């Protein structure tokens, strides 16, 4: 189809996300956060080498735990900013100009983290729609993937 992130998916994605991700329920974040990078490291072997600063080799290290929550909290902002696309565009350019200075960050890396999210979400979130999720997940990543290599 059009593959565009519709307003319908925005409502659908935000609503299923806001119930699973909230500020009062600590650990619910961290379990989701740790599982995504865990799925990424298995599929992408030469990816842990990109997260040595946060000690990506040691997943339960408090430094990689903090990074995990930082990554998907930024995702929570983007999903929340789906309602206000102007602020979202100005923010997506920030993450885009933030990630390419990290050498090794590639479009395929964001493509592998997409399959990482397509598998993890239905196990923790009920009424998960993969099509609606991906079409807006792609919409976000391509704004983060403005200036970098495939």
């Amino acid at each position: 189809s059009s593959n565009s992130c519709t307003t319908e998916d925005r409502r659908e994605m935000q609503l299923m996300w806001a119930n699973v991700w909230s500020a009062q329920f600590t650990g619910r974040r961290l379990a989701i956060a740790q599982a995504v990078f865990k799925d990424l490291f298995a599929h992408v072997p030469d990816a842990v080498g990109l997260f040595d600063r946060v000690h990506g080799t040691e997943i339960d290290s408090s430094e990689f735990k903090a990074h995990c929550i930082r990554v998907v909290n930024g995702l929570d902002s983007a999903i929340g900013l789906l309602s206000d696309p102007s602020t979202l565009n100005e923010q997506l350019s920030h993450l885009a100009t933030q990630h390419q200075e990290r050498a090794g960050v590639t479009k395929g890396g964001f493509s592998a983290i997409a399959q990482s999210f397509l598998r993890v979400m239905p196990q923790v979130a009920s009424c998960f729609n993969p099509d609606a999720w991906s079409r807006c997940f792609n919409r976000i990543t391509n704004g983060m993937t403005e200036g970098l290599a495939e």
Partner: protein, 149 residues
């Protein structure tokens, strides 16, 4: 076949009608015509030469004024028909034939036209939604600019 979702189309039509309806004074319709075309000719100075018939050498002329309304009326027609995919496909096919048959018009002109609107409208519409417009406009642009070099 399909252009954009009803919810996205609903967002576009409502925000478009806010700044463009029939009861608007003609002076506000001229401010829109020049600002959009002056910005278009700044992105594409090669495209300014093409509007010879509408007296483009003098944008303050009633002939060029009437031309900008024709373009906006056609744009206003397409936006308000975003919910009817059948009519919109016939409408977009008819505007393509008019522009393809005209000599000297490229596809990059319409793309630069897209970036003008995406930049001009935020300063006129309250809480402009770039996504919903990008979801509903780029189908129109590609459908109108279909078949052009």
């Amino acid at each position: 076949s399909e252009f954009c979702s009803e919810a996205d189309a609903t967002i576009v039509i409502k925000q478009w009608n806010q700044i463009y309806n029939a009861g608007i004074g003609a002076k506000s319709r001229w401010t829109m015509g020049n600002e959009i075309f002056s910005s278009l000719f700044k992105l594409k100075p090669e495209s300014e030469v093409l509007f010879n018939n509408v007296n483009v050498a003098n944008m303050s002329s009633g002939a060029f004024h009437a031309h900008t309304v024709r373009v906006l009326s056609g744009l206003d027609m397409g936006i308000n028909y975003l919910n009817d995919a059948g009519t919109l496909t016939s409408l977009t096919a008819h505007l393509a034939a008019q522009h393809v048959a005209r000599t000297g018009l490229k596809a990059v002109y319409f793309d630069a036209m897209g970036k003008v609107l995406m930049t001009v409208l935020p300063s006129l519409i309250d809480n402009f939604n770039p996504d919903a417009w990008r979801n509903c406009l780029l189908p129109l642009k590609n459908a109108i600019a279909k078949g052009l070099p």
